[PDB]
């Protein structure tokens, strides 16, 4: 049954910096916000941190090799600032930008194409004590960063993406306290998310002005399926502040130069910092939006959330070990909306995946039926994007191996490959066996 | 017949040093976590900053002669960790040390007692980065400030306080984000409070130590009169944690090595980090406890406040411009559950005062008549406690002057002396005045 998808469909992998990197001393790297966060107590579930991770610094050779086992044509990472300047701004670290050659380089060498995130949560401590996310001079940061890097890897990267997440970087780094640096406040959420749009916009320019003409570039959101628990007003309204938050807050600046009113009026307006003309930086025309969905969220009227005054409802079904629900549908329904409502010239799915808990067999074998079908349901939604003329350009699976998840630490193991911690051994799973056969069939099954 | 304090009651004043010194770059001072803090958009109502405060690093002698047209024999400040050890540990700045010198000696030189507080809310942000106060290694940072501050001036402060108002310190810094360093955390919090406790715990004997038979050392808690709004059990029950929460968790610990189990069971007992010892160090005795009164503050059950659960009432009354309401019958009903329930050997009243807006008159005057009629029932009250038999040796005014009120700004004017920032002139208020006679009258006119 050939259910191939388009001929040039780009299959890949994900990683970011921080997770799979570790050598956070290495070769002049400074200290992240996340090298100082993994230190507070209760941050990161596991009590772990980021220091060693998959030690791709040194290993990514082998981890390549790996792809190409994968039967991979892409590659999506993240490129670590405190690297390139550890001081945050001016000096730029040769070393650290070799590094990112060196990978480049050997990615290319064996036909795969790499997709660079150029900020993937891991800001140099020393440049986050100058300007955090909900100060305005964060812009011109990250756009010298985004210049220096930009000008030595064009020649060999045509993809980038410029910010991973904004909903993440903003909210659950400083309105939920979950993320680093780790502050909850409504204001400093609400003026980090302005300014990392402003950023994506400022950035832009300066990635087609140190590119060529093949070069194309956009932002990385994560989105979800939103539902409500029932019918009655007080859960749509609910459920309609939450996809505002969720889903909408980014989108909207991002096309119709507007935050959602609503929730705007919700919050208090003043506190969002715009300024004239900051809509037409936002505004400003990107190749394609690059999208993470994991799964469906559904909500009802409640104290949870206080800011939101949202409870959260598992609808029976089947859960992964993050306590996420899987509904592949999902991800269709994403893709349609974004299609109907804003029309990117193109998609990528730039995450996808699951958790659940690995075991190793006495085999030395791992097997994990549910990652499988977690993933087959998913390429089946995008393979029907496809089919609805929906122009998905390729998908990434998240994530190529176990790393730090964060603040679940490394009990968390999103791969299609497993790591053995103890010895850093690499095991293909049978998830990422099963891919092996989908990237050389194009696809299904 | 005259309402006479006794014979050698203490009558002061109280300020703290990032409140009222400025000079915050002068003679080897380094950044204190609050240098930081506000620059924070939204932490400081006002926009304001301590930068320049009263410029009483310059204008002390001219402060100190101004105490004494109020009259006072006692004055309660605190010392900048900051200025003594700037690097937060080792090198000592001895041109900070100096000038605590020069203030102590121009103080006795005019006959006032100095009464000193070691740790008053600016802890170097250098050593922050090392050590948070919900990171056990504070305990031994503050213990090395203690024993160097301590050596050089035990020889002409013979009255020390360790820490000011542990609740503010952890709650209002790590639990409410209110304070610096501005987190929001329950275990953070908790972590925060307990270190404090270890901190003050530790440095009893250290300053015994370094001091002679006259040496006297206490802690100084913030204590509030609590009522539930009604009779209802679920008023009551709130009531009760809120008591729990800012009145009863560092007395009981302090008194009886132990938290107040209902709250402490309502957190979750795992989250404060007890080690075997630490009751044994935080009942230290004590040579008095110090106590900082302001309101009555009236609980019923609520959502507002998610943490506890409750919400606050305004009952009518009397309010400050801090929208505090004004029951002097508090400070009396304080006092005697603390003589009652832990009998003290003395008790001072380190802080007690109030802010209303004040103008300057075309005759150049600030005449508050609110200010006063606060201060002359919070003083009968006090000489009610003492006609009671209750200890009470001393009673400090907050405020000297009006200072940097912290997360309000400037906005807030505490003092019995006016401040124009525009010249950094002093005027006296007429509250001030009338002070003047009840510090030499020594009792109520
Ligand atoms: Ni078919
Ligand atoms: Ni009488
Ligand atoms: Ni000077
Ligand atoms: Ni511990």
Chains 1, 2 share one sequence.
């Not at 579930?45 to 030690?55: K, L, V």
């Not at 007080?234 to 600046?253: H, I, V």
């Amino acid at each position: 049954e050939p259910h191939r998808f388009p001929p040039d469909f780009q299959w890949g992998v994900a990683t970011s910096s921080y997770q799979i990197e570790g050598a956070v001393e290495a070769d002049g790297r400074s200290p992240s916000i996340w090298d100082t966060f993994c230190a507070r107590p209760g941050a990161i579930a596991d009590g772990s941190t980021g220091a060693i991770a998959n030690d791709h610094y040194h290993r990514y050779r082998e981890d390549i090799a790996i792809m190409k086992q994968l039967g991979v044509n892409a590659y999506r990472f993240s490129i670590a600032w405190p690297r390139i300047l550890p001081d945050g701004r001016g000096r730029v670290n040769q070393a650290g930008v070799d590094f990112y050659e060196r990978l480049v380089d050997s990615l290319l060498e064996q036909g795969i194409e790499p997709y660079a995130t150029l900020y993937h949560w891991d800001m140099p401590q020393v440049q986050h004590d100058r300007t955090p996310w909900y100060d305005r001079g964060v812009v011109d940061a990250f756009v010298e960063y985004t210049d220096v890097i930009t000008r030595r890897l064009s020649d060999r990267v045509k993809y980038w993406m410029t910010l991973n997440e904004p909903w993440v970087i903003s909210f659950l780094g400083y309105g939920a306290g979950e993320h680093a640096p780790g502050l909850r406040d409504k204001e400093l959420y609400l003026r980090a998310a302005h300014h990392v749009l402003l950023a994506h916009g400022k950035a832009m320019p300066v990635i087609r002005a140190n590119g060529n003409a093949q070069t194309k570039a956009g932002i990385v959101l994560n989105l979800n399926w939103v539902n409500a628990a029932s019918d009655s007003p007080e859960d749509q309204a609910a459920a309609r502040r939450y996809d505002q938050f969720f889903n909408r807050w980014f989108a909207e600046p991002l096309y119709n130069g507007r935050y959602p009113e609503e929730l705007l009026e919700w919050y208090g307006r003043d506190l969002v910092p715009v300024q004239p003309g900051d809509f037409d930086i936002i505004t400003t025309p990107t190749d394609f939006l690059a999208v993470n969905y994991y799964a469906r969220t559904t909500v009802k009227a409640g104290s949870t959330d206080p800011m939101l005054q949202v409870d959260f409802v598992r609808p029976p079904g089947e859960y992964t070990a993050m306590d996420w629900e899987v509904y592949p549908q999902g991800l269709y329904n994403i893709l349609n909306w974004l299609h109907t409502d804003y029309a990117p010239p193109a998609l990528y799915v730039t995450e996808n995946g699951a958790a659940y808990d690995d075991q190793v067999s006495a085999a030395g074998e791992v097997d994990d039926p549910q990652r499988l079908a977690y993933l087959e349901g998913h390429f089946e939604a995008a393979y029907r994007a496809i089919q609805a003329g929906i122009p998905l350009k390729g998908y990434f699976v998240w994530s190529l191996m176990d790393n730090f998840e964060w603040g679940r630490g490394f009990e968390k193991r999103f791969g299609i490959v497993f790591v053995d911690y103890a010895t850093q051994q690499r095991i293909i799973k049978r998830s990422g066996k099963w891919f092996s056969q989908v990237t050389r069939a194009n696809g299904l099954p």
